[PDB]
Design an enzyme around this catalytic site. Structure first.
Site, PDB file in Angstrom:
ATOM      1  N   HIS A  61     -49.619  49.308 -13.645  1.00  0.00           N
ATOM      2  CA  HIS A  61     -49.429  49.998 -14.934  1.00  0.00           C
ATOM      3  C   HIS A  61     -50.692  50.749 -15.312  1.00  0.00           C
ATOM      4  CE1 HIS A  61     -47.746  51.002 -18.744  1.00  0.00           C
ATOM      5  NE2 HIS A  61     -48.659  50.358 -19.434  1.00  0.00           N
ATOM      6  N   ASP A  63     -52.302  53.145 -18.008  1.00  0.00           N
ATOM      7  CA  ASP A  63     -52.270  53.817 -19.312  1.00  0.00           C
ATOM      8  C   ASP A  63     -53.084  55.108 -19.276  1.00  0.00           C
ATOM      9  OD1 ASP A  63     -50.793  51.914 -20.808  1.00  0.00           O
ATOM     10  OD2 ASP A  63     -52.576  50.590 -20.765  1.00  0.00           O
ATOM     11  N   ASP A 175     -43.474  49.436 -20.604  1.00  0.00           N
ATOM     12  CA  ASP A 175     -44.385  49.198 -21.708  1.00  0.00           C
ATOM     13  C   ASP A 175     -44.076  49.865 -23.038  1.00  0.00           C
ATOM     14  OD1 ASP A 175     -46.602  47.553 -22.374  1.00  0.00           O
ATOM     15  OD2 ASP A 175     -47.981  49.263 -22.258  1.00  0.00           O
ATOM     16  N   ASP A 312     -51.554  45.676 -15.254  1.00  0.00           N
ATOM     17  CA  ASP A 312     -52.367  46.836 -15.621  1.00  0.00           C
ATOM     18  C   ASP A 312     -53.408  47.156 -14.568  1.00  0.00           C
ATOM     19  OD1 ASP A 312     -50.944  46.559 -17.967  1.00  0.00           O
ATOM     20  OD2 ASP A 312     -52.722  46.333 -19.279  1.00  0.00           O
ATOM     21  N   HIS A 442     -47.495  56.029 -24.660  1.00  0.00           N
ATOM     22  CA  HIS A 442     -47.270  54.944 -25.606  1.00  0.00           C
ATOM     23  C   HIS A 442     -48.553  54.329 -26.164  1.00  0.00           C
ATOM     24  CE1 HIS A 442     -47.311  53.140 -21.516  1.00  0.00           C
ATOM     25  NE2 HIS A 442     -48.023  52.199 -22.095  1.00  0.00           N
TER      26      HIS A 442
END
Ligand SMILES: OC[C@@H]1[C@@H](O)[C@H](O)[C@@H](O)c2[nH]cc[n+]21
Ligand SMILES: [Zn+2]
EC number: 3.2.1.114
Length: 1016
Positions: A61, A63, A175, A312, A442
């Site tokens: 994941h 971000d 997420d 993550d 997000h």
């Protein structure tokens, strides 16, 4: 033909509003599966002729900004993850990996040498590296507008088609903080066949798991026939991390996250570490793991099991790739060779999982339930509802909507022509689309990033706005200059944009004053753009250096105008009052601009030495005790003063609004003959708990219902004009303004929460509408969904995203509040609406951000307030999960999100200027929009291609007779059309070759895309 989206209540197995009404929500300790139950399975279920097929899907994941900026994470983490993925996948043919965030993948792949690019294309082509979703980001689903969800999806998938030659048909959304049916809507119209979601309320996971309804055909709430349906997999457990993806017991699953043994600085909070798999323990470990797998499988209907393996920013270190791969390989070899488990386990991709599920379905092994509704508001545990982020960092939430519209306008205005590469149009538009797309992340629009990351997003969006302005103003100069005179310098600024509401009055003094004078410049051309595909009138205002200004169109026809002072509000730290001051050097001129569909209209402002015939002047009344004078330079009408008192105003033939002595609306009278309907604005404040869990950027955990803001005796300013009147009041933390132009009022709040810690400021409307426990909010600007306030849920659970609007109604009356920015809101009592303005929180809320929200800055929130009689409207039945706007409310929403653009010619003389562009464009029915117009080809392409996204909303029928309007065929908007094709919404696949090169219009609530091809 078209499906009826109003009168047919779809029959679905699961309807989320209905489920919510019957569900209990009790938070009981379920054992090792804390929010579920002790799963039991029959060992004999699987056997030699019926094995459990297990796909372990490695993932990471990433971000695109959160605790670090995009570029910080790229340098510290993601470039290493992708570099090592390339090597390890290349060297280990059975290993697999899925990738979602194309912003990072594109950032990586353009730094690769050709050698490595080729290696990368080969592991994608052979299926080892699989893109899932393929958007620029994994967007927020609460605050994001559907247009920007599509934008970012298209940005990522266009990149993937061009450089990787793949288009994902499976989506991965592990997420976003709650999930919206706008995603399957867009995905299914973009070629997708499957999607996966994760963050849904723990009570919903339990309820659906009990019925094996975690995989479902997700259709839109109005869709009776089911053609919108998209197969959806909901993950069952609390997290997408490895402890919560192998099975129900995280103490066991954490032992199979081989990055947790110590050298990587990670551990298992359940206190049992992973152990390296060996010949001596592999039978024991395999037994533990397969038991978790078979328990997870009990929650699903086929014999194909999805086991995500990631977390993550995982799969970074080479040693990490090895430790996960080798240990899992050892497990698979043992498990697959031991018949007694009746399991075949392997690394897989997401598409592999879904393909096998549908093979099982086709073989008659399972039928799936149908579902409609949404998955807001999410709670991950106890009463921790994630409604805070519907409002956090509201400045940037508003900026999102401004940039949304500037991107559309820049793409549309520049699409009419091919541009030489030296104009750098494609470069500027790509930057603008990508910065807006990044913000859909997000942790972007949600307001859940660290302060310095929010600053990076803001800087990026500021550059994007500049890029849009540049493209827009070059395009206006080309569209409105006689062709044989047009002489562009592509670096020059022919026009500047004037925006009255962004950043907005008292946010920044970023508005240009048009300076006119007998001894310098007598007049100025201004140009308005209308991105909407119908003729539009809208009042526009400009700042001018004289009150003695008149307006003409470009046939030199006088245009009625109103001049008002330029008022700004000041916290006077001397008098301890919030009060307005009037400029003595600049004035506001207002007039009605009339602009063609998708077109431009030019007007001229001319100074004169005294009051012009067709320009009127507003009166001004300042209501306060102890007034002092307010001179206004040359402004011809003196300010009047009075003690605070109730007042009433009416512009044109529009409603009559009455205001309390504190400057707040108290009633609306729709007509001379009609009743004054109570409609009361009030500002209140929520606090934070002193005991227990604290509100932060994600969570809203109020210490009880809101308390009224103490207003004292605020200063009220009343401006009364023939074209525009307003009431403005300086309240604590809010300069609140009600503006009247002859129809539904506009509300503007300049919100500055200052140093009020642990405070959330809410704006509430109180009415006599007998709404009960029902209200309506929109999803992504696309659809309105029925909400029911549930007293079995805490206050913060009854908060929903308000991305563009909300309403309450009874049999006779509706009140609709449209917004120019996503915020959180609710109806906490019959007759009420409320919407949060800002929130300032001293504490962290234990979701990883590691800070409160203490970086507030003044934001100008904008709204329209529409009170209507609805007893004659044809509305959905009581059982229908949707609601629909009226024409007036839809137009009011459009006035907020896609206003006219205003351009001021930057030099003294525009030679070759033209009066109008687009007068021959068709003026489409009011429920149809050209959401996107984008030229898809650069100028050296022999066949030019232009893409259009057409969206038709559904407006309520209330007895206003329909008038003929013109059919809009986007394929004939540009000359020399040689082909018209219906495409997926990303423009990446041709679906239909259209007869006669005519693009049909779409049905209510549908969206279609077309591409026209032109010989050039
Ligand atoms: O708790 C939610 C936050 C999100 O804001 C981030 O997007 C997510 O990637 C993550 N990892 C750990 C914690 N969180
Ligand atoms: Zn995330």
């Amino acid at each position: 033909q078209c499906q009826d989206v109003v009168q047919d209540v779809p029959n679905v197995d699961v309807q989320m509003l209905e489920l919510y009404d019957r569900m209990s929500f009790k938070d009981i300790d379920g054992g090792v599966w804390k929010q579920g139950w002790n799963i039991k399975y029959d060992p004999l279920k699987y056997n030699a002729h019926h094995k459990l097929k297990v796909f372990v899907v490695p993932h990471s994941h990433n971000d695109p900004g959160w605790i670090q900026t995009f570029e910080e994470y790229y340098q510290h983490d993601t470039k290493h993850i992708l570099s090592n993925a390339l090597r390890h996948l290349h060297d280990n043919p059975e290993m697999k990996f899925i990738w979602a965030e194309i912003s990072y993948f594109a950032r990586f792949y353009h730094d690769l040498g050709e050698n490595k690019k080729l290696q990368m294309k080969s592991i994608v082509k052979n299926g080892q590296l699989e893109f899932v979703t393929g958007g620029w980001v994994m967007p927020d689903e609460a605050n994001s507008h559907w247009r920007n969800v599509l934008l970012q999806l298209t940005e990522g998938q266009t990149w993937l088609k061009q450089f990787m030659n793949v288009t994902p048909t499976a989506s991965w959304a592990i997420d976003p903080f709650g999930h919206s049916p706008t995603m399957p809507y867009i995905l299914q119209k973009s070629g997708f066949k499957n999607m996966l979601i994760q963050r849904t309320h723990y009570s919903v996971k339990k309820e659906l798991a009990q019925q094996r309804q975690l995989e479902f055909l997700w259709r839109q709430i109005w869709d009776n026939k089911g053609d919108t349906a998209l197969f959806t997999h909901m993950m069952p457990f609390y997290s997408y991390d490895i402890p919560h993806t192998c099975g129900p017991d995280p103490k066991v699953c954490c032992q199979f996250d081989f990055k947790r043994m110590g050298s990587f600085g990670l551990s298992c909070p359940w206190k049992v570490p992973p152990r390296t798999i060996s010949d001596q323990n592999v039978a024991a470990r395999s037994d533990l793991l397969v038991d978790q797998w078979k328990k997870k499988a009990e929650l699903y209907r086929t014999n194909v099991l999805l086991i995500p393996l990631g977390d993550d920013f995982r799969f970074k270190q080479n040693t990490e790739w090895d430790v996960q791969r080798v240990n899992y390989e050892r497990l698979f070899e043992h498990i697959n060779s031991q018949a007694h488990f009746n399991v075949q386990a392997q690394f897989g991709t997401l598409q592999e999982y879904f393909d096998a599920v549908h093979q099982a379905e086709r073989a008659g092994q399972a039928e799936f339930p149908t579902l409609s509704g949404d998955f807001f508001t999410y709670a991950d545990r106890s009463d921790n509802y994630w409604s805070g982020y519907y409002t956090s960092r509201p400045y940037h939430k508003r900026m999102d909507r401004v940039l949304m519209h500037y991107v559309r306008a820049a793409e549309m205005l520049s699409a009419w022509h091919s541009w030489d590469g030296m104009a750098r149009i494609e470069e500027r538009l790509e930057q603008a689309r990508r910065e807006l797309s990044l913000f859909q992340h997000h942790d972007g629009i949600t307001g859940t990033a660290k302060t310095h990351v929010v600053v990076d997003y803001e800087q990026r969006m500021q550059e994007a706005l500049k890029a849009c302005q540049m493209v827009m103003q070059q395009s206006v100069y080309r569209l409105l200059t006689k062709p044989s005179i047009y002489s562009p310098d592509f670096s020059f600024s022919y026009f500047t944009l004037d925006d009255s509401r962004w950043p907005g009055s008292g946010v920044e003094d970023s508005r240009t004053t048009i300076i006119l004078g007998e001894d310098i410049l007598p007049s100025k051309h201004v140009v308005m753009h209308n991105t909407l595909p119908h003729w539009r009138e809208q009042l526009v205002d400009f700042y001018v250096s004289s009150p003695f200004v008149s307006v003409t169109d470009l046939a030199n026809n006088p245009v009625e105008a109103q001049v008002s002072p330029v008022w700004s509000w000041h916290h006077d730290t001397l008098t301890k009052t919030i009060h307005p001051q009037g400029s003595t050097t600049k004035y506001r001129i207002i007039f009605k601009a009339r602009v063609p569909p998708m077109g431009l209209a030019t007007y001229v402002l001319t100074i004169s030495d005294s009051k012009p015939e067709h320009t009127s002047y507003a009166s001004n009344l300042l209501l306060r005790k102890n007034p002092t004078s307010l001179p206004l330079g040359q402004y011809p009408e003196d300010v009047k003063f009075g003690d605070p008192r109730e007042i009433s105003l009416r512009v044109g033939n529009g409603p009559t609004l009455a205001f309390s002595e504190q400057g707040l609306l108290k009633s609306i009278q729709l007509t001379q003959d009609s009743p004054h309907v109570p409609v009361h604005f009030k500002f209140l404040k929520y606090g934070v708990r002193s005991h227990g869990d604290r509100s932060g950027a994600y969570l809203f955990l109020p210490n009880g219902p809101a308390s009224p803001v103490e207003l004292g005796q605020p200063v009220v300013l009343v401006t009364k004009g023939k074209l525009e009147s307003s009431v403005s009041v300086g309240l604590p933390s809010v300069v609140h303004q009600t503006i009247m132009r002859g129809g539904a009022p506009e509300i503007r709040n300049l919100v500055d929460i200052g140093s009020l810690d642990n405070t959330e400021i809410v704006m509430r409307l109180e009415t006599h509408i007998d709404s009960g426990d029902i209200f309506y909010t929109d999803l992504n600007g696309l659809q309105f969904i029925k909400r029911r306030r549930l007293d079995k849920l805490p206050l913060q659970a009854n908060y929903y995203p308000i991305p563009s609007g909300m309403f309450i109604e009874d049999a006779n009356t509706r009140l609709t509040l449209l917004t120019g920015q996503p915020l959180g809101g609710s109806s906490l009592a019959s007759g009420e609406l409320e919407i949060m303005q800002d929130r300032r929180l001293a504490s962290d809320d234990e979701r990883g951000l590691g800070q409160g929200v203490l970086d507030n800055k003044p934001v100008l929130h904008i709204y329209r307030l529409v009170l209507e009689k609805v007893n004659n409207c044809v509305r959905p039945s009581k059982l229908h999960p949707a609601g629909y706007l009226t024409s007036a409310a839809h137009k009011a929403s459009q006035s907020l999100l896609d206003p006219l653009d205003k351009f001021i010619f930057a030099e003294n003389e525009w030679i070759g200027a033209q009066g109008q562009f687009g007068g021959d464009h068709p003026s489409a029915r009011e429920d149809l929009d050209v959401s996107v117009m984008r030229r898809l080809t650069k100028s050296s392409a022999k066949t030019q291609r232009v893409g259009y996204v057409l969206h038709r909303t559904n407006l309520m029928q209330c007895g206003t007779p329909e008038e003929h309007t013109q059919k809009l065929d986007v394929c004939h908007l540009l000359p020399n059309v040689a082909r018209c094709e219906r495409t997926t919404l990303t423009f990446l696949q041709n679906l239909e070759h259209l007869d006669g090169m005519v693009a049909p219009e779409v049905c209510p609530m549908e969206t279609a895309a077309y591409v026209s091809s032109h010989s050039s």
